[PDB]
Amino acid sequence: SVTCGGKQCKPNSCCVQNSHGKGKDSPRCHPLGKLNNPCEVEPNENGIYSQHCPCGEGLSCTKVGEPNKLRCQEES
């Protein structure tokens, strides 16, 4: 069970910070990253992402560019 912003969210959705510096960390529920899309290995020290979500639909963060342009790629 996922829990973001002091509220439980649906599965296949990571936590993302969407605060503009208001002082109240209020993340939002975003869908898991897809193929040929931008993804990150792991979240911050708190466990939250920026905008996109990590691979969770049968993908795997693989380096395709530089410096560290990690993208989602269906694992073999």
Query: What sign has the CA pseudo-torsion 18, 61, 44, 12?
Result: positive
Instruction: Please give the Cα distance from 38 to 40 (Å, whole number).
Output: 7
What SS3 state is found at 12? coil
Cross-strand partners of 10: none
Instruction: Please give the Cα distance from 66 to 29 (Å, whole number).
Output: 29
CATH assignment of 1-76, among 1.10.3210.10, 2.10.80.10, 1.10.3720.10, 2.60.40.10: 2.10.80.10
Start-to-end C-alpha separation, the chain: 27
Residue 16 is which amino acid? V
Domain boundaries, the chain: 1-76
